[PDB]
Amino acid sequence: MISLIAALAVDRVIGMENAMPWNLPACLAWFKRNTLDKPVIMGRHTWESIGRPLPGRKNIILSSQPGTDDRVTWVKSVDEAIAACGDVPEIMVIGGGRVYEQFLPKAQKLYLTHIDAEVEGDTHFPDYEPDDWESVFSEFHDADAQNSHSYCFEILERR
Amino acid sequence: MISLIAALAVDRVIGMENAMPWNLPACLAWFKRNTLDKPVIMGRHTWESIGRPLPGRKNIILSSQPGTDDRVTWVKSVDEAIAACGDVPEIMVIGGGRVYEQFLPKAQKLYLTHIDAEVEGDTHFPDYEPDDWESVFSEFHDADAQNSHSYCFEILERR
Numbered sequence A, B: 001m002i003s004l005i006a007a008l009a010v011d012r013v014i015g016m017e018n019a020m021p022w023n024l025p026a027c028l029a030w031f032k033r034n035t036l037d038k039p040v041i042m043g044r045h046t047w048e049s050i051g052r053p054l055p056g057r058k059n060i061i062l063s064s065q066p067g068t069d070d071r072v073t074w075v076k077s078v079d080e081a082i083a084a085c086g087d088v089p090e091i092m093v094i095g096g097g098r099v100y101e102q103f104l105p106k107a108q109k110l111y112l113t114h115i116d117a118e119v120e121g122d123t124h125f126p127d128y129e130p131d132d133w134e135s136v137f138s139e140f141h142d143a144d145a146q147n148s149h150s151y152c153f154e155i156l157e158r159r
C-alpha cells in the first residue's frame, strides 16, 4: 500500500522559499520512526533540501531531470517509482507538493504532523476530504526546551 | 578573557525556556567553531535545551539547584564558575539571560549572531552601548534551502 507522510503548518503549508522556520527534533524522530526500513519516494526539491540519502531506507527520487547521485535511485514516472519499490508492504511518499498530488489518489494512509505555525507558504498539501479518512491515532504535544512549536501527530486510514 | 556568545532575534530577544523558532545549521556551525576547545558556562535552561554535554568543551552549569548529571561541572556562583575554568586564554559564556547579565561587566568580547526573525519574548540580551564596544567584524548571509532566516555574525571588542 502507499502512504503519504507530511508535516503541515496552518493552512496546509508544507514548504516555503527557504528552510521552514522551526526546530522540531521530536517531529523528526516521528518521521524517522515511521519511514525506517521502508522505501521513500521524494521529488528533486525535497531531495536537495535533505542534503543526503536517508540512512536505512531505500531512497527513490522522482524527477524528469538526470541523476546527480549514485547513492540513490532516480526514476522518471510514478509507475517506475512504484516498480523500484519491489515487494514491500508499504511505500512512503515524503513530498513535496506535486509528488503528494500524484500519489494521493493511490494512498490508503496518511501520517500527518500538524504544527501550530502560521507562515506564508510556497507549496501546500493537497486538499483531503475529511469525510474520506478516519483518524486512528492522534497525540498532541506543547513546545518545550528542544521543540519550537506545539504539534500533533495523526494517522488516518482511507474509509 | 571572558567572551559572551549569543544569538539575538530582532530587538535583541533571546531564548528563555522553549526552543527558538528557526533552523540555522550555518549558525550552529559558527557557534561550534568559536567554542570548541574552550570552557563554556551556561545556566540551567540552556543546559536543558542542549540536552547533552557539548563535546570537546568543558561544560560548566551555573545554578542554585543540585546537579543531576555527573558529566559536567555544577557551580553555584560566578566566582566558582570562573575558578572551574582554570587558566585558559578565553572563557565562553553561552547564556541565557541571567547568565549574560552576570558576566557582561567582566566581558572583553562579544560574538553575536543577529537573526532577522521577529519572535515575541520576555527576555533580551543586556543593553550594550556599542560605543563602549567596537564592532570589529560583521558578515551577513541570506536565508537558503537549509537556513530559515538571514543572519549576520558580528564580533565586538570592549574599548
Ligand SMILES: CN(Cc1cnc2nc(N)nc(N)c2n1)c1ccc(C(=O)N[C@@H](CCC(=O)O)C(=O)O)cc1
Binding pocket: A005, A006, A007, A027, A028, A029, A031, A032, A046, A049, A050, A054, A055, A093, A094, A095, A111, A112, A113
Ligand atoms: C527537509 N526534510 C523533509 C521533511 C522533514 N520532516 C518531515 N516530517 C514529516 N512528518 N513528513 C515529511 N515528509 C518530512 N519531510 C527532512 C530533513 C532532514 C531529515 C532528517 O535528518 N531525518 C533523519 C532524522 C533527524 C536526524 O537524525 O537529525 C532521519 O533519519 O529521518 C528528514 C527530512
Ligand SMILES: CN(Cc1cnc2nc(N)nc(N)c2n1)c1ccc(C(=O)N[C@@H](CCC(=O)O)C(=O)O)cc1
Binding pocket: B005, B006, B007, B027, B028, B029, B031, B032, B046, B049, B050, B054, B055, B093, B094, B095, B111, B112, B113
Ligand atoms: C540550545 N543551544 C544554545 C545555543 C544555540 N546557538 C547559539 N548560538 C550563538 N551564537 N550563541 C549561543 N550562546 C547559542 N546557544 C544549543 C543547542 C544545540 C547545540 C549543538 O548541538 N551544538 C553542536 C553543533 C551542531 C550538531 O553537532 O548538531 C556543537 O558541537 O556545538 C548548541 C547550542
Ligand SMILES: [Ca+2]
Binding pocket: A134, A135, A136, A137
Ligand atoms: Ca478515531
Ligand SMILES: [Cl-]
Binding pocket: A042, A043, A044, A045, A046, A047, A095, A096, A097, A099
Ligand atoms: Cl519535491
Ligand SMILES: [Cl-]
Binding pocket: B042, B043, B044, B045, B046, B047, B095, B096, B097, B099
Ligand atoms: Cl539559562
